[PDB]
Design a protein around this ligand. Structure first.
Ligand SMILES: [Zn+2]
Ligand SMILES: [Zn+2]
Length: 89
């Protein structure tokens, strides 16, 4: 018998900011290619109208319900598996 106890908690933080020069346009995090004309931004990130897809099946989430798991995107199917049973927020 061990009858021991443990406990650990490591929070996380994010930061975004950049100064210099640019064409005032979002950079597709998918093909890293300047976006001009038509873009698709879910929450804070931006993705082309064609690049927007799952990371496992590459399914166009544009029309479908996009998801955010660990920064990466996913379809209702895959995503659901990842965020399966989310916490009360
Ligand atoms: Zn793109
Ligand atoms: Zn998928």
């Amino acid at each position: 018998g061990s009858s021991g106890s443990s406990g650990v908690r490591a929070p996380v933080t994010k930061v975004h900011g950049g100064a210099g020069s640019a064409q005032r346009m979002p950079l597709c995090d998918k093909c890293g290619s300047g976006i001009v004309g038509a873009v698709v931004k879910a929450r804070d990130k931006y993705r082309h109208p064609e690049c927007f897809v799952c990371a496992d099946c590459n399914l166009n989430l544009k029309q479908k319900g996009y998801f955010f798991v660990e920064g990466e995107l996913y379809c209702e199917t895959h995503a659901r598996a990842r965020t399966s049973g989310p916490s009360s927020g």
